[PDB]
Enzyme design. Structure first.
Site, mmCIF file in Angstrom:
data_model
loop_
_atom_site.group_PDB
_atom_site.id
_atom_site.type_symbol
_atom_site.label_atom_id
_atom_site.label_comp_id
_atom_site.label_asym_id
_atom_site.label_seq_id
_atom_site.Cartn_x
_atom_site.Cartn_y
_atom_site.Cartn_z
ATOM 1 N N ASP A 8 0.810 -1.229 0.000
ATOM 2 C CA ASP A 8 0.000 0.000 0.000
ATOM 3 C C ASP A 8 0.848 1.286 0.000
ATOM 4 O OD1 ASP A 8 -2.249 -1.802 0.567
ATOM 5 O OD2 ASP A 8 -1.708 -1.710 2.693
ATOM 6 N N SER A 29 2.457 6.821 0.368
ATOM 7 C CA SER A 29 1.644 6.002 1.272
ATOM 8 C C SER A 29 0.174 6.186 0.920
ATOM 9 C CB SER A 29 1.905 6.403 2.727
ATOM 10 O OG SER A 29 0.954 5.824 3.591
ATOM 11 N N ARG A 30 -0.498 5.148 0.408
ATOM 12 C CA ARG A 30 -1.889 5.273 -0.044
ATOM 13 C C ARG A 30 -2.893 5.399 1.103
ATOM 14 N NH1 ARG A 30 -6.211 5.509 -3.128
ATOM 15 N NH2 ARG A 30 -7.533 3.830 -3.682
ATOM 16 N N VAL A 31 -2.903 4.466 2.053
ATOM 17 C CA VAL A 31 -3.839 4.482 3.201
ATOM 18 C C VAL A 31 -3.423 5.370 4.381
ATOM 19 C CG1 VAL A 31 -4.756 2.227 2.490
ATOM 20 C CG2 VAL A 31 -3.093 2.294 4.299
ATOM 21 N N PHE A 41 -4.908 12.106 -2.211
ATOM 22 C CA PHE A 41 -3.448 12.096 -2.345
ATOM 23 C C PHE A 41 -2.792 13.473 -2.176
ATOM 24 C CE2 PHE A 41 -4.513 8.516 -5.490
ATOM 25 C CZ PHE A 41 -4.047 7.457 -4.693
#
Lengths: 86, 86, 116, 59, 269, 115
Positions: free
Chosen positions: A8, A33-35, F67
């Site tokens: 992830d 870092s996605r989460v 994001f």
């Protein structure tokens, strides 16, 4: 490439930054870092957003910095702040 | 003095026999003992001491050293010295 | 290992660690095993580990090793150099240029490195 | 000339009214510009900044 | 495709890197030839300045028009490390300043790269010279200098300047603008009248300053060319290093694929 | 991507963008060794438009908001063709290269250049 397709996000450590004295050699330009954006505490989340941009503003000027002292006040302040955050 | 005009052709002939005998192949299809083929040959080219000649000839030849000098020839492909036999 | 067990600090010199890897490749091919990446034996990392893990410092004594290293095709990413560099603690580089100036030993203080 | 110094300020070529005028006329003739323009040159920043950024990346 | 094409690219870039390394030392050699030519022409100009000072002070009877109230130098060839661009950038600041004042501008050009710049933006050029050798001769500058002197005598120009690079040091070329036209107990035995002498010496002085500006710009050019070929040599080294890593990957993959096909074919037979 | 399916205006805009990006890709090695200043006056203008086209192709998404923080943008086909056609014609040669990065429609590049 297989593990990047499973995890992830990734922390990339760069050999050039490590040999340049920046020992925690995290490469901000490609580390992600996605989460984790939903995981930070309120104090670190609010103060970190202003710091990632400062390192991005330094990324484009770092090599050229030696002959950037005679440029406009905006370029000079972005570079000076980028060196302090680095 | 001995000249082996093509050790690469000796390796090709030994590879043919090995593949026809159904022996297990390695890199470039050569057998596991192709290094031992040339090494067993080339370590005979040497200079021997006076004691060796005196022992071999049962004292018929004294105070002289014998020798065998070798000039093996190998053919490369487009200057590639990293090939297996070379 | 016998000298180490007498309570001593010992030096083990290996003439060439690349030839140890190649002898393993040759034996693996003679036994008919299926070859791995770049044609090396499938047991490449285990054969290196079995040799290198005995060279250590223990409660009785120690064995320190100086090993000459050959790099195939000047490629530091090749399986033989790459498997060997995982066990090394220091790198001593000898320079033809430094020897030409009359300095001996011809170590290059800039290219040579140590984890210590 | 001065009592303790003599200076000769020579010339590399023989100056003269025809040679002096001919080189000037030839410098007009060499500037053979079909369309002179105006000189406004409003593209100054668009050209100067492009080369300023490009010249920095090369070193 | 594979290792063969990469090996050809590496040899091609390596052949180019060898000459850019040689061209740096050739530029340094020519820089020293230009620096000795800069020093050789100074005695003549300082002495002409010393004569005009006394010959004007001592003769208040006449004031030459040059004593009461652009020539651009550029290269003819490639490999200049920003030399011409930094000069035009500095010139445009003063031309814009003259248009805030509302004044008209006349321009003179030395070198092929200067002519191309004004032609791409519509600048009015009154005179132009080009294709001069790396070691120029003062007799070629007479033409371009006279057209600019005449425009002053005709009242078309209030001030005239020479735009060129100055040699601060071997690693620093500074773009500059210098004013050309608007500048003790005994007297000389003037053979012709002192007015006739003042008219000729002021012309020799301005031509000498333009020649000195041209020779110093050529010294700055060789110094800029040294840096450009040094950078080209270093940039080619990074490309060679990246291609070598790609080549080693292709070398290892070809051996692995050949072994896989030989083991696969012998398992079937 | 056929004139009989999408019409000549869309087809020529798309073909124009591909021609500029292809020519810029051919100059990459020359620009890497000698820099942009050695190129012809025609190649310099094309490289400048190629850099703007390459940046105008970027777009903030409504799923990518987590994001970075930026709001997402939806751009119609009409607005897409108009923006790239203008950059190819030279209608935006004066705006700075960073004004095209992450802005949705072409009018937002004009507002971003004001900063």
């Amino acid at each position: 490439t297989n593990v990047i397709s499973i995890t992830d996000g990734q922390i990339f450590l760069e050999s050039a930054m490590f040999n340049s004295g920046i020992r925690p050699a995290v490469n901000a330009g490609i580390s992600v870092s996605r989460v984790g954006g939903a995981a930070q505490t309120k104090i670190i989340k609010k103060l970190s957003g202003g710091i990632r941009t400062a390192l991005a503003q330094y990324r484009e000027l770092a090599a050229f910095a030696q002959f950037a002292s005679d440029l406009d006040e905006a370029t000079r302040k972005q570079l000076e702040h980028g060196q302090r955050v680095t | 003095l001995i000249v082996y005009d093509d050790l690469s052709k000796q390796a090709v002939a030994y590879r043919q026999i090995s593949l026809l005998l159904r022996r297990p192949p390695g890199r470039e299809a050569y057998p596991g003992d192709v290094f031992y083929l040339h090494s067993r040959l080339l370590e005979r080219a040497s200079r021997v001491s006076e004691e060796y000649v005196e022992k071999f000839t049962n004292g018929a030849v004294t105070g002289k050293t014998g020798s065998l000098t070798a000039l093996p020839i190998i053919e490369t492909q487009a200057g590639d010295v990293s090939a297996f036999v070379p | 290992e016998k000298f180490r067990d007498e309570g001593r600090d010992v030096l083990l010199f290996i003439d060439n660690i690349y030839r140890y890897t190649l002898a393993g490749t040759e034996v693996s091919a003679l036994l008919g095993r299926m070859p791995s990446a770049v044609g090396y034996q499938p047991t490449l990392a285990e054969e290196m580990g079995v040799l290198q893990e005995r060279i250590t410092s223990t409660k009785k004594g120690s064995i320190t090793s100086i090993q000459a290293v050959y790099v195939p095709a000047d490629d530091l990413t090749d399986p033989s150099p790459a498997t060997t560099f995982a066990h090394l603690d220091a790198t001593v580089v000898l320079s033809r240029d430094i020897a030409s100036l009359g300095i001996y030993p011809a170590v290059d203080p800039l290219d040579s490195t140590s984890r210590q | 000339v001065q009592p303790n110094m003599v200076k000769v300020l020579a010339d590399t070529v023989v100056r003269a009214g025809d040679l002096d005028e001919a080189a000037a006329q030839e410098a007009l003739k060499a500037a053979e510009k079909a369309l002179q323009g105006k000189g406004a040159e409003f593209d100054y920043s668009a050209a100067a900044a492009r080369l300023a950024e490009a010249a920095a990346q090369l070193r | 495709a594979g290792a063969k094409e990469i090996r050809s690219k590496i040899a091609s870039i390596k052949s180019t890197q060898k000459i850019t390394n040689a061209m740096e030392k050739v530029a340094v050699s020519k820089m020293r030839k230009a620096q000795m030519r800069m020093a050789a022409g100074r005695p003549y100009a300082e002495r002409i300045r010393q004569v005009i000072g006394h010959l004007a002070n001592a003769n208040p009877e006449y004031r030459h028009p040059f004593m009461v109230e652009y020539i651009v130098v550029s290269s003819d060839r490639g490999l200049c490390g920003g030399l011409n661009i930094n000069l035009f950038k500095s010139l445009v600041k003063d031309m814009s300043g003259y248009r805030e004042q509302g004044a008209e501008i006349d321009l003179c050009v030395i070198g092929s790269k200067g002519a191309s710049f004004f032609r791409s933006f519509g600048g009015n050029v009154v005179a132009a010279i080009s294709h001069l050798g790396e070691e120029p001769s003062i007799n070629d500058l007479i033409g371009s200098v006279k057209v600019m002197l005449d425009a002053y005598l005709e009242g078309r120009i209030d001030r005239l300047f020479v735009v060129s690079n100055k040699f601060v040091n071997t690693m620093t070329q500074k773009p500059t603008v210098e004013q050309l036209i608007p500048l003790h107990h005994w007297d000389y035995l003037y053979e012709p009248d002192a007015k006739s002498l003042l008219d000729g010496l002021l012309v020799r002085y301005v031509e000498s300053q333009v020649y000195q500006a041209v020779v110093e710009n050529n010294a700055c050019e060789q110094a800029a060319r040294m840096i450009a070929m040094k950078n080209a040599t270093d940039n080619a080294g990074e490309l060679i290093s990246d291609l070598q890593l790609i080549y080693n990957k292709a070398r290892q993959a070809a051996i692995t694929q050949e072994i896989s096909e030989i083991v696969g074919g012998a398992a079937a037979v | 991507l056929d004139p009989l399916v999408i019409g000549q205006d869309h087809y020529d805009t798309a073909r124009g963008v591909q021609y500029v990006l292809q020519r810029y890709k051919e100059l990459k090695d020359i620009i890497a060794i000698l820099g942009m200043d050695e190129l012809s006056e025609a190649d310099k203008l094309l490289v400048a438009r190629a850099r703007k086209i390459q940046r105008f192709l970027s777009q903030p998404f409504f799923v990518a908001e987590v994001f970075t923080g930026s709001p997402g943008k939806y751009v119609s086909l009409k607005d897409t063709i108009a923006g790239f056609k203008g950059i190819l014609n030279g209608d935006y040669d004066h705006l700075p290269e960073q004004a095209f990065y992450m802005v949705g429609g072409i009018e937002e590049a004009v507002e971003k250049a004001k900063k």
